[PDB]
């Protein structure tokens, strides 16, 4: 598929955002999605992940209780609720497909299709 993200903008610490990652084709249904953020000065961080069915949802230790990944295979969209946006969350986020249907098969694949990242900035 062909992936495009949206939603990154200027918010102050503690604010709310809701990113997105839209797909071109309906092959989106067969891909377990991952959210990966890229620091302005460093490499990448894994943020979250979701299964193809959406029933196997995992978060990074630094982000649980704040973010809420969700998808809609009929809408060919991937979202990421972005609450309590906090001092080090400024980054560029990448939505990357795994291919493995469930979390048990994620280690047998890699994140292959990345969309153009969306810049998120938090500051007073």
């Amino acid at each position: 598929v062909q992936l495009v993200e949206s939603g990154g903008g200027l918010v102050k610490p503690g604010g709310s955002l809701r990113l997105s990652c839209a797909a071109s084709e309906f092959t989106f249904s067969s891909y377990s999605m991952n959210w990966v953020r890229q620091a302005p000065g460093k490499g990448l961080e894994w943020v979250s992940s979701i299964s193809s069915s959406g029933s196997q949802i995992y978060y990074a230790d630094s982000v649980k209780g704040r973010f809420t990944i969700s998808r809609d295979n009929a809408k060919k969209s991937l979202y990421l609720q972005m609450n309590s946006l906090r001092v080090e969350d400024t980054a560029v986020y990448y939505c990357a497909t795994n291919g493995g249907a469930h979390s048990s098969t994620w280690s047998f694949y890699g994140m292959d299709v990345w969309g153009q990242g969306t810049t998120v900035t938090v500051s007073s």
Binding site: S29, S30, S53, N73, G100, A101, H102, S104, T105, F108
Partner: peptide
């Protein structure tokens, strides 16, 4: 034999 299910979307 780590088997992944590609049979259905909803059940």
């Amino acid at each position: 034999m780590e088997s992944e299910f590609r049979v259905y979307s909803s059940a």
